[PDB]
Amino acid sequence: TESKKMSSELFTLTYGALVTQLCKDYENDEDVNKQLDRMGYNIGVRLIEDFLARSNVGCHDFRETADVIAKVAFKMYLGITPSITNWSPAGDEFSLILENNPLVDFVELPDNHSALIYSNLLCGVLRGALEMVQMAVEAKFVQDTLKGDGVTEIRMRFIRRIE
Amino acid sequence: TESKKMSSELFTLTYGALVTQLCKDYENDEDVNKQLDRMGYNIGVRLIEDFLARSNVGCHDFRETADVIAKVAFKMYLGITPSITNWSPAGDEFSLILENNPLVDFVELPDNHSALIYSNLLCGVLRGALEMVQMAVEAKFVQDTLKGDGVTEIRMRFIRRIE
Ligand SMILES: *C(=O)CCCCCCCCCCCCC
Ligand SMILES: *C(=O)CCCCCCCCCCCCC
């Protein structure tokens, strides 16, 4: 059963509607951040099932994992291939560098909303999906083009191996 | 500037999160229907700009319009090509037949939520985008696989030509 392939524009705008609704429902940026994360988590727990049926993985080590997330999973679900950089010497941390993040196409952050992590849904997705492969991880944004950085950066930290 | 191409799964689940949030925020199916429509409208008004920069159209008649929506716009933004059927003799009505609607992948409607038009965002998108091409239209779901039909059907009615 082949998956349907689409341009990112409707997705981007729909995600935009979700963030707007949440900002109306909460009025507090930190809370929006948290709800985006929780939703992302519930999404990742289901998404990993789809991924493992379209990819031959299952697993290895934290490095192999980084490679599969950037080169296969992001490409498949977002049409982009983030770069992997800045590995910690222990190999328990790495960064995903997103030069182009579809979620923020057509988006510009209003002032004083500096606490808002617009694409925070992605941290929840990552954490949730990885948990289903018996990997506890922490995902967090440390660079965001919406705040003026040259790139968007998601820092990934391996906490433990669920068993 | 080429658009990024992605699988529909993350989009489907994200739209699912939006519907869930709205159902929590409203508790009333009719209202969810209306908000999905309004959001869809705001999305379509912007989306049409992207479309006209990726498509050579601008316009003709209601029939040509049907053809561009099903064969070019749906394919581009949702990865599917709906069929056009049941033209009214006056040529002011037609139906879009969606055998597969990405928005409802992995979705099953709970009971008593018969009034909910799960993918109603699409009616708003259509109405809004068409309005920007000086066409007033009405879009409405008359068949929905989520309610047991063999296909999903969106009935399109041309109201007037904005000028
Ligand atoms: C083991 O060798 C690697 C296991 C990789 C699991 C990846 C799961 C990714 C699914 C969600 C990512 C979504 C990114 C947009
Ligand atoms: C004139 O000849 C035809 C004009 C067609 C305009 C189509 C606009 C479609 C953009 C939104 C559709 C989204 C469907 C998922």
Render chain A in DSSP notation, one character per residue: -PPPEEESHHHHHHHHHHHHHHHHHH--HHHHHHHHHHHHHHHHHHHHHHHTTTS------HHHHHHHIIIIIHHHHHS---EEE---TTSSEEEEEESS-GGGTT--PPTT-TT--TTTHHHHHHHHHHHTTT-EEEEEEEE-GGGT-SSEEEEEEEEE---
The CA distance from B25 to B126, in Å, is 25
Chain-chain contact of A11 with B7 (C-beta, under 8 angstroms): no
Which residue owns the Cα nearest ligand 1 atom 15?
A: A74
Tell whether B14 lies on the interface with A, counting CB pairs under 8 A. Answer: yes
Chain-chain contact of A125 with B10 (C-beta, under 8 angstroms): yes
Which residue owns the Cα nearest ligand 1 atom 7?
A: A69
Among candidates B6, B43, B46 on the partner chain, residue whose Cβ is nearest the Cβ of A77: B6
**B158 token code pair:** 């041309």
Dihedrals phi, psi of A139, to nearest 5 degrees: -120, 135
The CA distance from A98 to A84, in Å, is 9
Nearest CA in chain B to A43: B13
Model resolution, angstroms: 1.9
Strand partners, A94: A156
The 3-state DSSP class for residue B13 equals: helix
Chain-chain contact of A4 with B125 (C-beta, under 8 angstroms): no
| Shortest alpha-carbon distance between residue A128 and chain B (Å) | 13
Nearest CA in chain A to B39: A17
Q: From B159, B104, B100, select the one nearest B126 (Cα to Cα).
A: B159
The CA distance from A119 to A80, in Å, is 15
The CA distance from B85 to B93, in Å, is 9
Chain-chain contact of A78 with B125 (C-beta, under 8 angstroms): no
Per the document, the length of chain A is 163
CATH superfamily, region B1-163: Trafficking protein particle complex subunit 3 (3.30.1380.20)
**From the alpha carbon of B51, which atom of ligand 2 is closest?**
10
Q: What is the CB neighbour count within 10 angstroms for residue A78?
A: 23
**From the alpha carbon of A44, which atom of ligand 1 is closest?**
11
The CA distance from B125 to A16, in Å, is 14
Q: What is the CB neighbour count within 10 angstroms for residue B116?
A: 22
Q: Answer yes or no: are the C-beta atoms of B48 and B41 closer than 8 Å.
A: no
**A121 token code pair:** 């849904």
Helix axes A9-26, B121-131, angle to 10 degrees: 110
> Please, which residues have CB within 8 angstroms of residue A58's CB and are 6 or more apart in sequence?
A52, A133
Chain-chain contact of B43 with A17 (C-beta, under 8 angstroms): yes
Structure determination method: X-ray
Ligand 1 site: residues with CB under 6 angstroms?
A: A 44, 47-48, 51, 57-60, 64-65, 68-69, 73-74, 77-78, 125-126, 129, 133; B 10
Three-state DSSP string of B129-144? HHHCCCCEEEEEEEEC
* Cβ contacts of B26-30, under 8 Å, gap ≥ 24: B29/B113, B29/B115, B29/B116, B30/B115
Q: Answer yes or no: are the C-beta atoms of B78 and B8 closer than 8 Å.
A: yes
The CA distance from A19 to B118, in Å, is 19
**A62 token code pair:** 């934290």
**A105 token code pair:** 């196409």
Q: What is the CB neighbour count within 10 angstroms for residue B2?
A: 7
| Shortest alpha-carbon distance between residue A137 and chain B (Å) | 20
The 3-state DSSP class for residue B158 equals: strand
